[PDB]
Design a binder for this molecule. Sequence first.
Ligand SMILES: [Mg+2]
Ligand SMILES: [Zn+2]
Ligand SMILES: [Zn+2]
Lengths: 90, 57, 50, 1160
Amino acid sequence: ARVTVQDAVEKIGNRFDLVLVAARRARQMQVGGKDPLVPEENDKTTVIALREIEEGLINNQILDVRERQEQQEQEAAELQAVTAIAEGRR
Amino acid sequence: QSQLKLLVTRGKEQGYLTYAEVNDHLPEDIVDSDQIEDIIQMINDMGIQVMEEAPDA
Amino acid sequence: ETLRVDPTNDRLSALVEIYRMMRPGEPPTREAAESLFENLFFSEDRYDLS
Amino acid sequence: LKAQTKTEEFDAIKIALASPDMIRSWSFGEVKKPETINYRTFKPERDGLFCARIFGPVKDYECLCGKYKRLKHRGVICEKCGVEVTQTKVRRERMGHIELASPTAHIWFLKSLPSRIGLLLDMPLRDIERVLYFESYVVIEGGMTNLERQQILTEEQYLDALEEFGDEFDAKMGAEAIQALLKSMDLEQECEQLREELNETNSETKRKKLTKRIKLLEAFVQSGNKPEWMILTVLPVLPPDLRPLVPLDGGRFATSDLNDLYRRVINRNNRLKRLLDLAAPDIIVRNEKRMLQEAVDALLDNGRRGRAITGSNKRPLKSLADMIKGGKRVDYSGRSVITVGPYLRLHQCGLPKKMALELFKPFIYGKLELRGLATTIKAAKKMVEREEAVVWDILDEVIREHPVLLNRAPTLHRLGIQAFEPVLIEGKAIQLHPLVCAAYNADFDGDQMAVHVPLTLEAQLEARALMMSTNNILSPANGEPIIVPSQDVVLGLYYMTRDCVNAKGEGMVLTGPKEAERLYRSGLASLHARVKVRITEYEKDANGELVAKTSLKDTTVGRAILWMIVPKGLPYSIVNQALGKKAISKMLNTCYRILGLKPTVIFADQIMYTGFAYAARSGASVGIDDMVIPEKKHEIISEAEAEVAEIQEQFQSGLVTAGERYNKVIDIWAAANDRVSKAMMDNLQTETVINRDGQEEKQVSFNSIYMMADSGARGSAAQIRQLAGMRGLMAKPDGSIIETPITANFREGLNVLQYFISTHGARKGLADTALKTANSGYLTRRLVDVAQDLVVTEDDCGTHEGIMMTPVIEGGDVKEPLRDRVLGRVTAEDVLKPGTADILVPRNTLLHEQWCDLLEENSVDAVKVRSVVSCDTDFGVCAHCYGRDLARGHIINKGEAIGVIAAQSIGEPGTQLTMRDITGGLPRVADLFEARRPKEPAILAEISGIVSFGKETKGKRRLVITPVDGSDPYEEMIPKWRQLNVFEGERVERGDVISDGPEAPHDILRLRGVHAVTRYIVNEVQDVYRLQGVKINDKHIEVIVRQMLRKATIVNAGSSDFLEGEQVEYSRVKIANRELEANGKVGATYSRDLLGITKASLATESFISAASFQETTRVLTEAAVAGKRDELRGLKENVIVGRLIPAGTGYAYHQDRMRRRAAG
Ligand SMILES: [Mg+2]
Ligand SMILES: [Zn+2]
Ligand SMILES: [Zn+2]
């Protein structure tokens, strides 16, 4: 997708929304848990996110849901510390 | 009378805002740096009605 | 028509009006009103067509 | 339970007057001395303009004296010197104040066009407000006998009135007098009594001043500001760092003028305070107060009255206002001379090795320390500063898919800045793709372009998904391709057609690709014969896909090999069967519409490679024998001068009107010029003989020059006519034409005389260019300022109404049709069909479906279409109602930026407009947009009635027409001057012509209709683009006319107050919310009002946005008076504040925050 980037907008209209979600994913890759889905092949996170969007995976709703599960994974799994702190001030 | 009639009738609208015109058709001591801004302000921007605010001021 | 629109009537009022037009401020006198108009088109140190 | 008290996110900014206590709140101390820095130690004085205790410390964390040095005491003030030891940037943010003895008038609210302090108080400005506060004529402050409430008295009148009464009407003079006047003024009780008195039995002889002041008083009282704040008793002080005095090179300090201002005001203020303790002679003290007035007024804003001077400079001093009344340098940037780069792709650019090395410096650092190589960050610096081989390979990694965006000086439109993938090149020059070299209007005269590095992550994706060159295939202005092949490439593909007969020809047939082998191996030529070959075509229909079609067609060598470049689809061959001229772009266009982006992009690179390569093979040059003069030149010239000779002899013997024989003899030479021009072209066009089989035949000249002209590549008829034909009628400085045209031409010698004549043309050519180039941008600035706030929103509203689109027809008496003005347009509603059905309701007319509007014959030449002119949107634009025309093929993306793109496209071709019942040119465009009444305006019938004379010249007067019918009459005023067009007794319709002259857009909108006036502006502004031959879509004209018709005027009775001319934005939203709120009778009907670009842009919600272009001193003041607040939706105002733009990649952010600000 190093020359449009047009195939990606077909999967999600509004080229502006495309930039937001693609940057959102490219941000996840650059810093934090990387884990690309399409093979890298020496491509920057800039384009890697766009390759995914073209492929059909990783859209706006998809990331939001995986963030919901990510939150349920960080919270529900480590609630033993929060509940312990909850009894701190009665 | 003189200032009001001359200003209005002439400026319609003097095309390219001919500043160097009516300032000579004014009394009192000339060559001032005070009366200047009071003319550049009225002519444009708020046309028509501004030319009725000028005389009353 | 030019005379019909001329406020001044003599040499004093003329030189005085010119003195008030050129240097609007101080009260026009005799020496000042005269010497000024003379030092405009009638003085080598103040005027020259070359 | 928020109520946070820190510097968090803000949704709006407020502007208003500042109370004396409001100033104190900012005060981190009081300046009391005119002193700045020490004469010997160069140290901040105690309580001077540059105090350390009041403002901030000199050094970062060490105090003034030196009792405390390091970070040990960063929160504690020093013992010997109350110096808070934090940062030095504290010095940049700390306020402070000066407290004056006697009150002082704020120069802005005193003398800034309308007297704010005066009109609020109802009092003359430079007449009365001056003489009473300059200590000359005492003023009254309310009396219950003899005297009134604001009369002006003299010393003699004062004591007389004091003697008669006194001690019960006390009223001072000066600043503090006006203070008590503004303070004693009750905005409440006056707001009531003014409403009472100024509504009692008064026609239109008073209502002017009535409505004006009452609105002004209601605003100010509701503003929250107390009129006490108008004149200040406490003057705040600007932070020292914003007006420093810094040592330059070898002494010689450099200080701001504000220090002179603050130092003066301090001196005069302290002297005043001293005189208000010692002996106080009225003359001495009152003068010093006036002197304090001078200093303060000069410090706030010089302007204005003589201009304070001093400071050794004969030039005035830059006061506070002049520093904020009236280009953004940026890091990670560079520039260099541009160079052609043929080997590049459409998404690539040659970025110099050393250039890119310095530009990606922080990226190289990070990637070095990331991999290894450099042990630390400073090692990376030392490693790249010593460009150590390996670093270059790291560089090749960092610029990989990291787009860089290029920019040229004259940025007329969006395509001025386009992004590419950086390509390392061993050189110091920046190479560019020769296809987008036309979008920049860039040549290689030594022109130079700048480069920017998208640092932010989404900044790269923005450059890749929006600004990337591959996404800019079509022009935003017109749907046609912009990256279309130019001079070199086009001549190339023109050479790959051009069927020449025989000459190593013959119709030896084969199969496409094999023909390549035939050309390289000689034997056969290339431009023959014609020759037949097998073409495997591919087409699609209904269910798409692809359908093969092998056949045998008669093409040429060039067409066969060129066929390889053509993409999968397309009609094939026939696109090559033509030539290379304008269809060269046509081929690219259709490919884009039937294939898509990528197939068109690669197709562009391929046709570029092809054109260049085969153009080199062709070796077209320009010898001296290439521009062949006609043989009948001397003949035609002799015949033309023979004719004029007879005409001169006639003039000698009277006969013919000598007064205008000049005109007819010019017609002689003008005909003669056309004769030589026609002869030169007909000769240089055909010619040739060749020798096919049995010889004798004719084609078209292979005369290089002709080939360039017959294939774009900068070669027009006029220029060629000057080369071989003759330079025709030459202009004279007077403006008149010389009756002795340049008989000779450039192929021949040129006599000194006619060259000294032609130099006038060259001089005025370059000069007129220099003017219209700056005037073009001058127009664009106005277009942008007015239009750059609207963006397509709320997806796709309802509404069906819209201008009925019809082919622009001058064919009434000249025959000239143009019917491509409907495409990518959303249909109003099922626009009929000679029978039934067909066209849907909201179906956007596709490119292939506009071609379907020819299958319904020439009968259907009218379709109602939704436009930005209509659209029942509120503060934006319906997506459907707009269209689609972009570099993109689909409809405009929701939350684009229609405004700026519209203005750009309109003012981009401004470079090519010639300034002058037909004005014509850029000036005509301006007048049409400004909506200026003609020098001889026509007149229309407001109501349909019976025309009859209304008292023949009985005024005054000057004729009078009275169209009366049904009910009620009218009396129009005809000034004798100029005739008429309708006899007495005859009837007229609602808006009929009765002057047969130039029409005024004001009357058309006011009477004829909105569709009529907008149709007028678009069709009339286009007509000047028709002559200049510049293609520009009608959409953008409608876009500006949209908010050109932004505001209206209400005439009835509603929640809005009648005479107020308010915009349909608030109107429509408020009239919709009243029919179903309480009653429709609590609201009035409005009336659209035409106002020009400037007059429209003058009005806008944001006060910061206004403070951008219009007079900042004015807008900021009047916006200060009333409790105004920007909050905060516009583009321009949201740029200077330095935040996300409410459009495009933003928009979503603003929409979220906009709804977010609904809780409170
Ligand atoms: Mg150039
Ligand atoms: Zn200290
Ligand atoms: Zn709409």
